[PDB]
Symmetry: C3
Subunit: 138 residues, 3 copies
């Protein structure tokens, strides 16, 4: 699924040419999905304002089929936040990320819908079961 | 309701001047709603990347009050996809469309909310019943 | 939470320099949240078309943690609408606002998630109870 969208007022000319590629590789591992279907939409130098002022501020969204829940959400947000403060030089008291759960049958990749089984993170549970066996009875 | 949003890295200068009007008329019929309330937001030459590369790639969204479900979703996605490959010259293994169901009482067109009855596709069922009668007992 | 996003084809050069600050202060009071965490993303001179024509048209979204419901939604929409007609010189039969309810544990502000209690508007009920007592038994 994944679609990481970053709206910031930070001007593109102040953005490391390798930011979208770093974020791409970070969220590919984070959401445990193929790198081939990971979008990163940078909206740099956006006419965005937060709190009525115009400092380094960011509003990011993560669209994902499954993977998203309170425990993982917070983890990802922290990582995205840390990656914004250091590379976009924003703040952390000026960053809001919204995680958007996407129904599998409401999302069309390559002339087909998604598997509802992945929306229920069933591929991870089955990995959980696999790794269990290995180092719980070889 | 309808709001078709297309984020592509394809430069506006390579976009048929009649693309937004074609897509507009396609999705007006598809979602069975007035053409007057159909938005098409083209975000051409967007700083969007998919898979860490920068080929012809697309992330479209369809915001609709009702109409949206697994069977119609897939149909629309296919049509939108076909309309992107030929007019935006993207790919099909580089297109992801997200269908977003919109609550009728969470969407304000012209100083009023929407009818919850349309969110439940009750105008189509009633059309279904009408056409039934016609060619099932004149 | 709040994130007010305005996509209009109205050119930035025709937008009062104080529009985003007016809308910011309006929706800060409306959604009863700190002004510090209110985003306004203006997408002026957007390649957006509605009805297949290119008049003054607007598609706004309100992302909020709680606050949003049929009675308040309509109120806000009316106010936003009135603020678009007069300052963006759009129409009112050319404005659609979508209110998006945001799960508190699916939204990360400043290295933490949001309080689920605010998503249930429990801070307002408690204010309701407080003010009740005052002018119902001093
Ligand atoms: Cl959404």
């Amino acid at each position: 699924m994944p679609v990481i969208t970053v709206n910031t007022n930070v001007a593109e000319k102040s953005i490391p040419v390798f930011f979208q590629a770093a974020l791409t590789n970070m969220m590919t591992k984070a959401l445990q999905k193929p790198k081939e279907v990971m979008f990163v939409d940078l909206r740099s130098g956006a006419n965005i304002m937060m709190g009525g002022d115009r400092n380094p501020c960011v509003f990011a969204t993560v669209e994902c089929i499954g993977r998203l829940n309170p425990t993982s959400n917070l983890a990802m947000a922290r990582d995205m936040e840390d990656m914004f403060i250091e590379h976009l030089n924003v703040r952390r008291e000026r960053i809001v990320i919204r995680f958007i759960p996407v129904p599998a049958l409401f999302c069309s990749f390559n002339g087909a819908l998604h598997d509802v089984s992945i929306e229920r993170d069933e591929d991870i549970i089955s990995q959980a079961i696999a790794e269990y066996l290995h180092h719980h009875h070889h």
